Design a protein around this ligand. Structure first.
Ligand SMILES: *C(=O)CCCCCCCCCCCCC
Ligand SMILES: *C(=O)CCCCCCCCCCCCC
Lengths: 91, 91
């Protein structure tokens, strides 16, 4: 269950592994910010979610919902690009 | 939330991705049994650990100590095979 920085090291390490295999590298600081954004919008994801296209699509919808409510500038510039690359991996 | 299976779906999904790309397939129930064993012996791992050799070697030591103390029949048969394969994936 998420709470602050809990799970952050492991998430970042898995994310970096997945993206790097497609030739895309993310700074650790950017990957941390992405994690913090994800658990803010979709806290159910570590707890109840799977790394599968269905649940990842739900995360995407929830990220877009957040932008609709708080504005585009409110979300990390790397969030949609990282989300999209993981979506492609899951296809 | 007081679900007893927090994180289990995410774990099973990531484990099955990593193992399948090496040609190895684990029954869902077996992957769940492994997760429950992992968080029993090494509750710090999802919280603070990463998918790296130092952390995974530590989980390895802790699993072995559990076996020394409780006997090898108290441990899932698939636990050491799974741990070993993940050690190699990190190498
Ligand atoms: C709170 O939500 C608990 C979160 C537990 C997440 C399960 C851990 C996810 C691990 C996936 C990677 C496993 C690699 C060995
Ligand atoms: C998971 O199901 C979250 C449940 C959290 C329950 C909190 C209940 C707290 C009751 C005691 C409150 C005392 C302080 C006012």
């Amino acid at each position: 269950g998420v709470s602050g920085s809990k799970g952050q090291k492991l998430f970042v390490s898995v994310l970096q592994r997945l993206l790097s295999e497609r030739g895309l590298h993310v700074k650790e600081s950017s990957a941390i910010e992405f994690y913090q954004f994800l658990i803010k919008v979709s806290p159910w994801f570590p707890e109840e979610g799977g790394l599968n296209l269905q649940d990842w699509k739900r995360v995407g919808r929830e990220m877009k919902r957040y932008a609709a409510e708080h504005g585009t500038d409110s979300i990390p510039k790397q969030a949609y690009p990282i989300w999209l690359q993981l979506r492609e991996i899951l296809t």
